Design a protein around this ligand. Structure first.
Ligand SMILES: CC(C)CCNC(=O)Cn1cc(-c2ccc3c(-c4nc5ccccc5[nH]4)n[nH]c3c2)cn1
Length: 203
């Protein structure tokens, strides 16, 4: 593989995905993504690591100065930016994201590192808000924080400053529209000490 085999379009992710580019394999015309790194400053496992809710790494290559990561392109963007569109997601929507995500974590986390496929299906790529108390003093806690933020439009522990305490003491509450099925799953996940609503609502 070489840089010259690819057409480059626009940067895709301006926010520390700011080095991944819309790209296109020259011969087949297939649309792809290209992440570019300067060597001056892993890749082998993610290659034969295939799953529908995980972005493919298709390969890597380098030259005298840089390293290039050939990645699947997710046409519909980040889950993050959909959340900013719709302000919050309906139950049907969040529930299918969650099982998609549990499926991803099973085979193996933030709305901005989450991408959307051709059919709107979620795929994983790769401060405080999504971190468990243990980890600040885990991917199930994260799932809990994500399920809340999908139904609600903000993460459950949002405060003005970083001064931590809300998370460590699990102080969070629900607006009323959030059903007990939703509440139960979330409250089970957001336990300080490290499903019917998920079926029913999903695919
Ligand atoms: C060694 C290995 C672990 C590296 C593989 N991971 C990375 O290179 C980090 N990374 C960036 C991405 C990334 C970021 C954004 C996109 C996108 C994408 N599509 C978009 C469509 C509209 C708006 C934004 C979009 N971003 N597609 N694929 C992506 C892939 C995925 N992984």
């Amino acid at each position: 593989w070489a840089l010259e085999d690819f057409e480059i379009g626009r940067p895709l992710g301006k926010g520390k995905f700011g080095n991944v580019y819309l790209a296109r394999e020259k011969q087949s015309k297939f649309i792809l993504a290209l992440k570019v790194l300067f060597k001056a400053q892993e890749v082998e496992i993610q290659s034969h690591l295939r799953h529908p809710n995980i972005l493919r790494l298709y390969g890597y290559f380098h030259d005298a100065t840089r390293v290039y990561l050939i990645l699947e392109y997710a046409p519909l963007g980040t889950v993050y930016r959909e959340l900013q569109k719709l302000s919050k997601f309906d139950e049907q929507r969040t529930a299918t994201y969650i099982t998609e995500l549990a499926n991803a974590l099973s085979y193996c986390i933030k709305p901005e590192n989450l991408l959307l496929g051709s059919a709107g299906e979620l795929k994983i790529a790769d401060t405080l808000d999504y971190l468990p108390p243990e980890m600040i003093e885990v991917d199930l806690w994260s799932l809990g924080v994500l399920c809340y933020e999908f139904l609600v439009g903000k993460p459950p522990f949002e405060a003005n400053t970083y001064q931590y305490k809300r998370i460590s003491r699990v102080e969070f509450t629900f607006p009323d529209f959030v059903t007990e099925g939703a509440r139960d799953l979330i409250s089970r996940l957001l336990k300080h000490n490290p499903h019917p609503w998920i079926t029913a609502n999903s695919s």
